[PDB]
Amino acid sequence: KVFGRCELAAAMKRHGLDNYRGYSLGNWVCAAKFESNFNTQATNRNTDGSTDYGILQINSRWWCNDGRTPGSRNLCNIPCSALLSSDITASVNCAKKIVSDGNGMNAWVAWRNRCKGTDVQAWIRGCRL
Ligand SMILES: [Cl-]
Ligand SMILES: [Cl-]
Ligand SMILES: [Cl-]
Numbered sequence: 001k002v003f004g005r006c007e008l009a010a011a012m013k014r015h016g017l018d019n020y021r022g023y024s025l026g027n028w029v030c031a032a033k034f035e036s037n038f039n040t041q042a043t044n045r046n047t048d049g050s051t052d053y054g055i056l057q058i059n060s061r062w063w064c065n066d067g068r069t070p071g072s073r074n075l076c077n078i079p080c081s082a083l084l085s086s087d088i089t090a091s092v093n094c095a096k097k098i099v100s101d102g103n104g105m106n107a108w109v110a111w112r113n114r115c116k117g118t119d120v121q122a123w124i125r126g127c128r129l
């Protein structure tokens with residue numbers, strides 16, 4: 001599924017990401033825009049041979065099992081394919097674990113390089129939330 005911006009904001013708010021560990025909703029929408037272009041089916045291979053999956057580009061080295069990332073953990077206890085669903089529940093629940101892990105949203109390289117220190121409230125402007 002390719003989400004609309006306000007559609008995704010609403011879905012993420014429903015799931016309790018608004019101000020989760022202090023990150024306002026615009027941060028999450030911004031991250032999703034630059035990680036996946038709001039596309040749940042997005043996949044991208046990393047240099048290390050791991051793969052990033054879904055709307056928040058969650059990595060197979062640490063977080064999900066894709067059967068082909070040697071020496072990897074599966075800390076969200078989920079097949080990576082579950083992160084490509086039109087239902088974002090699995091992605092959001094896993095992201096909550098990641099962002100609680102010590103480095104906050106700095107775990108998302110696109111957030112750090114493209115969203116951090118910018119006016120992220122712009123990403124939810126005009127949305128009925
Ligand atoms: Cl929308
Ligand atoms: Cl947009
Ligand atoms: Cl914030």
Ligand SMILES: [Cl-]
Binds near residue numbers: 026120121124
């Ligand atoms: Cl915001």
Ligand SMILES: [Cl-]
Binds near residue numbers: 068
């Ligand atoms: Cl393969």
Ligand SMILES: [Cl-]
Binds near residue numbers: 067068070071072
């Ligand atoms: Cl694996």
Ligand SMILES: [Cl-]
Binds near residue numbers: 086087088089
């Ligand atoms: Cl959803």
Ligand SMILES: [Cl-]
Binds near residue numbers: 021022103104105
């Ligand atoms: Cl933090």
Ligand code: NA
Binds near residue numbers: 063065069
């Ligand atoms: Na893994």
